[PDB]
PDB file of C-alpha atoms and ligand atoms in Angstrom:
ATOM      1  CA  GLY A   1      12.913   5.413  12.834  1.00  0.00           C
ATOM      2  CA  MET A   2      12.015   3.928   9.351  1.00  0.00           C
ATOM      3  CA  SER A   3      15.084   2.169   8.380  1.00  0.00           C
ATOM      4  CA  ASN A   4      16.782   3.672   5.071  1.00  0.00           C
ATOM      5  CA  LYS A   5      16.520   0.597   3.098  1.00  0.00           C
ATOM      6  CA  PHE A   6      12.882   1.253   2.468  1.00  0.00           C
ATOM      7  CA  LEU A   7      14.114   4.326   0.244  1.00  0.00           C
ATOM      8  CA  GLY A   8      14.274   3.770  -3.508  1.00  0.00           C
ATOM      9  CA  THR A   9      12.047   2.658  -6.457  1.00  0.00           C
ATOM     10  CA  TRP A  10      10.249  -1.131  -5.883  1.00  0.00           C
ATOM     11  CA  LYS A  11       8.217  -3.194  -9.054  1.00  0.00           C
ATOM     12  CA  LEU A  12       5.755  -5.646  -7.959  1.00  0.00           C
ATOM     13  CA  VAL A  13       7.075  -9.233  -8.968  1.00  0.00           C
ATOM     14  CA  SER A  14       4.558 -10.969  -7.400  1.00  0.00           C
ATOM     15  CA  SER A  15       0.346 -10.618  -5.941  1.00  0.00           C
ATOM     16  CA  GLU A  16      -0.924 -13.549  -4.558  1.00  0.00           C
ATOM     17  CA  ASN A  17      -4.748 -12.955  -3.578  1.00  0.00           C
ATOM     18  CA  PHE A  18      -5.150  -9.222  -5.050  1.00  0.00           C
ATOM     19  CA  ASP A  19      -8.620  -9.650  -6.943  1.00  0.00           C
ATOM     20  CA  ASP A  20     -10.283 -11.351  -3.506  1.00  0.00           C
ATOM     21  CA  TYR A  21      -8.897  -8.146  -1.533  1.00  0.00           C
ATOM     22  CA  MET A  22     -10.230  -5.492  -4.011  1.00  0.00           C
ATOM     23  CA  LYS A  23     -13.617  -7.253  -3.705  1.00  0.00           C
ATOM     24  CA  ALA A  24     -13.088  -6.843   0.168  1.00  0.00           C
ATOM     25  CA  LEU A  25     -13.084  -3.299  -0.413  1.00  0.00           C
ATOM     26  CA  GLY A  26     -15.600  -3.255  -2.714  1.00  0.00           C
ATOM     27  CA  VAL A  27     -13.683  -2.725  -6.369  1.00  0.00           C
ATOM     28  CA  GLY A  28     -16.110  -3.396  -8.945  1.00  0.00           C
ATOM     29  CA  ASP A  29     -15.696  -5.880 -11.895  1.00  0.00           C
ATOM     30  CA  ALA A  30     -13.798  -4.116 -14.481  1.00  0.00           C
ATOM     31  CA  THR A  31     -11.920  -1.959 -12.413  1.00  0.00           C
ATOM     32  CA  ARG A  32     -10.290  -5.244 -10.521  1.00  0.00           C
ATOM     33  CA  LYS A  33      -9.493  -6.756 -14.105  1.00  0.00           C
ATOM     34  CA  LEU A  34      -6.968  -3.553 -14.496  1.00  0.00           C
ATOM     35  CA  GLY A  35      -6.132  -3.999 -10.988  1.00  0.00           C
ATOM     36  CA  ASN A  36      -4.916  -7.388 -11.601  1.00  0.00           C
ATOM     37  CA  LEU A  37      -3.384  -6.749 -14.661  1.00  0.00           C
ATOM     38  CA  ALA A  38      -1.136  -3.639 -13.083  1.00  0.00           C
ATOM     39  CA  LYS A  39       2.432  -3.941 -12.430  1.00  0.00           C
ATOM     40  CA  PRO A  40       3.087  -0.835 -10.353  1.00  0.00           C
ATOM     41  CA  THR A  41       6.314   0.756  -9.082  1.00  0.00           C
ATOM     42  CA  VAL A  42       6.408   1.714  -5.530  1.00  0.00           C
ATOM     43  CA  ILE A  43       8.627   4.889  -4.595  1.00  0.00           C
ATOM     44  CA  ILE A  44       9.304   5.569  -1.167  1.00  0.00           C
ATOM     45  CA  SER A  45      11.394   8.883  -0.463  1.00  0.00           C
ATOM     46  CA  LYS A  46      12.099  10.701   2.700  1.00  0.00           C
ATOM     47  CA  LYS A  47      12.285  14.634   3.206  1.00  0.00           C
ATOM     48  CA  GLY A  48      12.816  15.283   6.768  1.00  0.00           C
ATOM     49  CA  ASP A  49      10.312  13.350   9.105  1.00  0.00           C
ATOM     50  CA  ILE A  50       7.948  13.387   6.664  1.00  0.00           C
ATOM     51  CA  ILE A  51       7.668   9.857   4.448  1.00  0.00           C
ATOM     52  CA  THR A  52       6.382   9.881   1.164  1.00  0.00           C
ATOM     53  CA  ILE A  53       5.031   6.505  -0.724  1.00  0.00           C
ATOM     54  CA  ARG A  54       3.977   6.999  -4.647  1.00  0.00           C
ATOM     55  CA  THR A  55       2.567   4.177  -6.500  1.00  0.00           C
ATOM     56  CA  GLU A  56       2.777   4.610 -10.216  1.00  0.00           C
ATOM     57  CA  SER A  57       1.154   2.659 -12.747  1.00  0.00           C
ATOM     58  CA  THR A  58      -0.839   2.944 -16.344  1.00  0.00           C
ATOM     59  CA  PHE A  59      -3.739   2.446 -14.519  1.00  0.00           C
ATOM     60  CA  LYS A  60      -3.675   4.607 -11.327  1.00  0.00           C
ATOM     61  CA  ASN A  61      -1.249   6.838  -9.405  1.00  0.00           C
ATOM     62  CA  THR A  62      -1.512   7.237  -5.630  1.00  0.00           C
ATOM     63  CA  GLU A  63       0.626   9.359  -3.814  1.00  0.00           C
ATOM     64  CA  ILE A  64       0.464   9.791   0.545  1.00  0.00           C
ATOM     65  CA  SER A  65       2.300  11.732   2.452  1.00  0.00           C
ATOM     66  CA  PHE A  66       2.545  11.557   5.948  1.00  0.00           C
ATOM     67  CA  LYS A  67       4.433  11.732   9.713  1.00  0.00           C
ATOM     68  CA  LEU A  68       4.790   8.430  11.911  1.00  0.00           C
ATOM     69  CA  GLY A  69       1.763   8.208  13.970  1.00  0.00           C
ATOM     70  CA  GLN A  70      -0.219  11.288  12.736  1.00  0.00           C
ATOM     71  CA  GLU A  71      -3.771  11.082  10.962  1.00  0.00           C
ATOM     72  CA  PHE A  72      -3.549  12.083   7.640  1.00  0.00           C
ATOM     73  CA  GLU A  73      -6.440  12.470   4.837  1.00  0.00           C
ATOM     74  CA  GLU A  74      -5.757  10.067   1.960  1.00  0.00           C
ATOM     75  CA  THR A  75      -7.426   9.099  -1.477  1.00  0.00           C
ATOM     76  CA  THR A  76      -7.101   5.588  -2.729  1.00  0.00           C
ATOM     77  CA  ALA A  77      -6.282   4.109  -5.884  1.00  0.00           C
ATOM     78  CA  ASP A  78      -9.839   2.851  -6.253  1.00  0.00           C
ATOM     79  CA  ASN A  79     -10.847   6.540  -4.764  1.00  0.00           C
ATOM     80  CA  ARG A  80     -11.679   6.003  -1.309  1.00  0.00           C
ATOM     81  CA  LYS A  81     -11.422   8.871   1.085  1.00  0.00           C
ATOM     82  CA  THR A  82      -9.798   7.397   4.319  1.00  0.00           C
ATOM     83  CA  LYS A  83      -8.316   8.851   7.340  1.00  0.00           C
ATOM     84  CA  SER A  84      -5.081   7.003   7.490  1.00  0.00           C
ATOM     85  CA  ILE A  85      -2.126   6.467   9.984  1.00  0.00           C
ATOM     86  CA  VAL A  86       1.372   4.751   9.425  1.00  0.00           C
ATOM     87  CA  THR A  87       3.001   3.277  12.412  1.00  0.00           C
ATOM     88  CA  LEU A  88       6.518   1.342  12.912  1.00  0.00           C
ATOM     89  CA  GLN A  89       6.504  -2.105  14.777  1.00  0.00           C
ATOM     90  CA  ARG A  90       9.444  -4.337  14.235  1.00  0.00           C
ATOM     91  CA  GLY A  91      10.883  -2.662  11.443  1.00  0.00           C
ATOM     92  CA  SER A  92       7.633  -3.226  10.069  1.00  0.00           C
ATOM     93  CA  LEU A  93       5.822  -0.066   7.987  1.00  0.00           C
ATOM     94  CA  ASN A  94       2.097  -0.694   8.936  1.00  0.00           C
ATOM     95  CA  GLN A  95      -0.792   1.368   7.348  1.00  0.00           C
ATOM     96  CA  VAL A  96      -3.987   1.187   8.626  1.00  0.00           C
ATOM     97  CA  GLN A  97      -7.030   3.003   6.367  1.00  0.00           C
ATOM     98  CA  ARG A  98     -10.382   3.858   8.110  1.00  0.00           C
ATOM     99  CA  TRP A  99     -13.641   4.925   6.038  1.00  0.00           C
ATOM    100  CA  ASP A 100     -16.990   4.528   6.684  1.00  0.00           C
ATOM    101  CA  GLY A 101     -16.660   2.264   9.803  1.00  0.00           C
ATOM    102  CA  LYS A 102     -14.782  -0.160   7.729  1.00  0.00           C
ATOM    103  CA  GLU A 103     -10.708  -0.550   8.453  1.00  0.00           C
ATOM    104  CA  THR A 104      -7.833  -2.218   6.129  1.00  0.00           C
ATOM    105  CA  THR A 105      -4.019  -2.596   7.064  1.00  0.00           C
ATOM    106  CA  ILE A 106      -1.154  -2.343   4.545  1.00  0.00           C
ATOM    107  CA  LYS A 107       1.763  -3.886   6.251  1.00  0.00           C
ATOM    108  CA  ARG A 108       5.190  -3.284   4.538  1.00  0.00           C
ATOM    109  CA  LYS A 109       8.323  -5.124   5.471  1.00  0.00           C
ATOM    110  CA  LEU A 110      11.659  -5.911   3.900  1.00  0.00           C
ATOM    111  CA  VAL A 111      12.600  -9.667   4.028  1.00  0.00           C
ATOM    112  CA  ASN A 112      16.056 -10.330   1.938  1.00  0.00           C
ATOM    113  CA  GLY A 113      16.205  -7.379   0.106  1.00  0.00           C
ATOM    114  CA  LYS A 114      12.596  -7.493  -0.805  1.00  0.00           C
ATOM    115  CA  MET A 115       9.602  -5.330   0.375  1.00  0.00           C
ATOM    116  CA  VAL A 116       6.635  -7.564   1.256  1.00  0.00           C
ATOM    117  CA  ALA A 117       3.236  -5.836   1.365  1.00  0.00           C
ATOM    118  CA  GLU A 118       0.719  -7.638   3.163  1.00  0.00           C
ATOM    119  CA  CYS A 119      -2.922  -6.455   2.530  1.00  0.00           C
ATOM    120  CA  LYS A 120      -5.592  -7.336   5.110  1.00  0.00           C
ATOM    121  CA  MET A 121      -9.392  -6.764   5.222  1.00  0.00           C
ATOM    122  CA  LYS A 122     -11.640  -8.540   7.108  1.00  0.00           C
ATOM    123  CA  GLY A 123     -10.320 -12.186   6.701  1.00  0.00           C
ATOM    124  CA  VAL A 124      -8.804 -11.887   3.308  1.00  0.00           C
ATOM    125  CA  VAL A 125      -5.434 -10.875   3.571  1.00  0.00           C
ATOM    126  CA  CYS A 126      -3.306 -10.232   0.299  1.00  0.00           C
ATOM    127  CA  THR A 127       0.543 -10.709  -0.241  1.00  0.00           C
ATOM    128  CA  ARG A 128       2.325  -8.475  -2.661  1.00  0.00           C
ATOM    129  CA  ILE A 129       6.578  -8.460  -3.242  1.00  0.00           C
ATOM    130  CA  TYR A 130       8.499  -5.557  -4.775  1.00  0.00           C
ATOM    131  CA  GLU A 131      12.132  -5.988  -5.909  1.00  0.00           C
ATOM    132  CA  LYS A 132      14.361  -3.204  -5.571  1.00  0.00           C
ATOM    133  CA  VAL A 133      15.257  -1.904  -9.192  1.00  0.00           C
TER     134      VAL A 133
HETATM  135  C1  LIG B 201      -2.313   1.322  -8.515  1.00  0.00           C
HETATM  136  C2  LIG B 201      -2.886  -0.256  -9.176  1.00  0.00           C
HETATM  137  C3  LIG B 201      -3.939  -1.042  -8.810  1.00  0.00           C
HETATM  138  C4  LIG B 201      -4.760  -0.042  -9.362  1.00  0.00           C
HETATM  139  C5  LIG B 201      -6.530  -1.343  -8.624  1.00  0.00           C
HETATM  140  C6  LIG B 201      -7.175  -0.351  -7.690  1.00  0.00           C
HETATM  141  C7  LIG B 201      -7.824  -1.189  -6.823  1.00  0.00           C
HETATM  142  C8  LIG B 201      -8.204  -0.684  -5.004  1.00  0.00           C
HETATM  143  C9  LIG B 201      -6.760  -1.333  -4.751  1.00  0.00           C
HETATM  144  C10 LIG B 201      -6.121  -0.493  -3.576  1.00  0.00           C
HETATM  145  C11 LIG B 201      -5.092  -0.888  -2.769  1.00  0.00           C
HETATM  146  C12 LIG B 201      -3.707  -1.422  -3.581  1.00  0.00           C
HETATM  147  C13 LIG B 201      -3.357  -2.087  -2.017  1.00  0.00           C
HETATM  148  C14 LIG B 201      -1.557  -2.364  -2.804  1.00  0.00           C
HETATM  149  C15 LIG B 201      -0.894  -2.062  -1.797  1.00  0.00           C
HETATM  150  C16 LIG B 201       0.904  -2.335  -2.651  1.00  0.00           C
HETATM  151  O1  LIG B 201       1.242  -2.923  -3.016  1.00  0.00           O
HETATM  152  O2  LIG B 201       1.573  -1.097  -2.368  1.00  0.00           O
HETATM  153 CL1  LIG B 202       1.253  -1.061 -14.510  1.00  0.00          CL
END
């Protein structure tokens, strides 16, 4: 299953192309301004086969609990009501969000101890790097 190296508290240290990714989601100007200034902490925890990913930031908090491969209702930070699935592909934790005929992916993988989150929407790719704290 998911590597236990995912479990723990993660702090954003780098974000690239987040503004254009938010635009792709349809996020308004003022919201993106605070979204680009946020330095969220991500906590990944596990209770049995239920994985929990909590994101904490001054602006917004989110939390999703899921089992690999099983669709679930999700509310994103920008307040999208999506049906989402998390899968494992070569150790990569890949989350797909679907809503209003749209689709975006957030792929999380471990690289030299860092967690690297690739966010894709249409032809827009955003990379966010976290470090274990
Ligand atoms: C939680 C801070 C950002 C809040 C601003 C809302 C803009 C919508 C962005 C929602 C998708 C976030 C993708 C980041 C994924 C991650 O790095 O874990
Ligand atoms: Cl923050």
